[PDB]
């Protein structure tokens, strides 16, 4: 269901922070949600599975599925194939952002 | 390994284009990829089926069945912008007190 | 490829920095592809007291094939035969790339508090398990003095 709450039918924005701001991004402060599942390294070429939002490096989540088994490695949700996954450029920009590499 | 930055240079990976905030309960179209808060793309696809950025067609008939909750996003948003997650708890109960 | 080595280095650092509940793993020596473990025996089990050790292998191709696990500390169990060979099935066919040895680990504490018996390595013991657990319990505890302490 998306029905929408009634807080939700009426909610209005949270506006952007835009003073010179620094965010401290400490090592573990993103570090479940800009690490690949499968090599336990930092996102590389960000791949996403379109049924569940779950993401991977493009060349572990293609060996994944090369090496047989059609899930999620996260939740274990039926993959067909790499047409089940889609490439994920913005979470790529988001993580060269904070970490140029 | 810490590293500092700007939050203007953080704030277009962490923004709503439609209402042009932060990601709240951010939602995304499983088509494309592009993230809404889950308010703002709810709406919108009550009236196109087509992404409002990149215009690709989200469903033939139902757009809403190709949408999904992005935990992971959502999440990354309410860690890096501080305060913002209290603000909008905070929000919540403002308003269920007053209703 | 060294691709599995840097894989169970990494698995080695978050294990330093946050110690499973109940259990430790590392190499046995100087082969990262050979590891032991040491598992507690869960407080809500027959097992409670006892410290069982297991033998851990991973393949050259981890983590997109599971590890090979067995105990090499008897005990008496349903799923698990004297050959220290274990009946789970995220060793398996529902293994996943996103597992861990941390997560095995835990993995198989539960097993030890909540045998399987629908998918027994023992028959005799799974057997006794769902028609007598006070029979089990016994029999558990007996053994887990004797082998495990
Ligand atoms: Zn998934
Ligand atoms: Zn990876
Ligand atoms: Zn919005
Ligand atoms: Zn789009």
């Known amino acids: 269901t998306w029905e929408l709450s009634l807080y939700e039918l009426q909610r209005t924005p949270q506006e952007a922070i835009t003073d010179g701001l620094e965010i401290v ?17 930092m996102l590389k070429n960000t791949m996403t599975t379109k049924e569940c939002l779950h993401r991977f490096c493009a060349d572990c989540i293609i060996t994944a599925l090369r090496s047989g088994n059609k899930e999620c490695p996260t939740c274990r949700k039926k993959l067909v194939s790499k047409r089940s996954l889609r490439p994920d450029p913005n979470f790529d920009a988001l993580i060269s952002k904070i970490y140029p590499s | 390994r810490t590293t500092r930055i700007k939050i203007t240079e953080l704030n277009p990976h962490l923004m709503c284009v439609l209402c042009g905030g932060y990601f709240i309960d951010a939602t995304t179209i ?18 196109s089926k087509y992404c409002p950025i990149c215009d690709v067609q989200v469903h033939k008939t139902r757009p809403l069945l190709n949408i999904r909750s992005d935990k992971t996003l959502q999440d ?6 501080p305060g913002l997650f209290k603000n909008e708890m905070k929000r919540r109960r403002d308003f269920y007190a007053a209703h | 490829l060294g691709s599995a080595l840097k894989r169970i280095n990494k698995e080695l650092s978050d294990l330093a920095r946050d110690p499973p509940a109940q259990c430790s793993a590392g190499p046995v020596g100087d082969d990262m592809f050979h590891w032991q473990a040491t598992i ?41 035969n004297s050959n220290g060979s274990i009946c789970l099935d995220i060793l398996r066919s529902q293994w996943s790339p996103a597992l861990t040895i941390s997560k095995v680990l835990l993995s198989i504490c539960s097993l030890l508090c909540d045998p399987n018996p629908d998918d027994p390595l023992v028959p005799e013991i ?6 007598d657990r006070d029979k089990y319990n016994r029999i558990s505890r007996e053994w887990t003095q004797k082998y495990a302490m």
């Not at chain 1, 573990?28 to 800009?34: D, V």
């Not at chain 3, 025996?41 to 067995?70: C, E, M, R, W």
Request: glycine share 4%; with cysteine; hydrophobic share 35%.
């Open chain 1, 25 to 41: 991004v400490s090592p573990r402060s993103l570090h479940s949600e800009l690490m690949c599942p499968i090599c336990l390294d």
């Open chain 2, 30 to 47: 499983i088509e494309c990829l592009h993230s809404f808060c889950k308010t703002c793309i709810v709406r919108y696809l009550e009236t």
């Open chain 2, 76 to 81: 990354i948003v309410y860690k890096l912008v």
């Open chain 3, 40 to 80: 507690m025996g869960p407080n809500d089990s027959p097992y409670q007291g006892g410290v069982f050790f297991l033998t851990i292998h991973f393949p050259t191709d981890y983590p997109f094939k599971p590890p090979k696990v067995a105990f090499t500390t008897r005990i008496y169990h349903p799923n698990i």
């Open chain 3, 126 to 131: 799974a057997r006794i398990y769902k028609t």
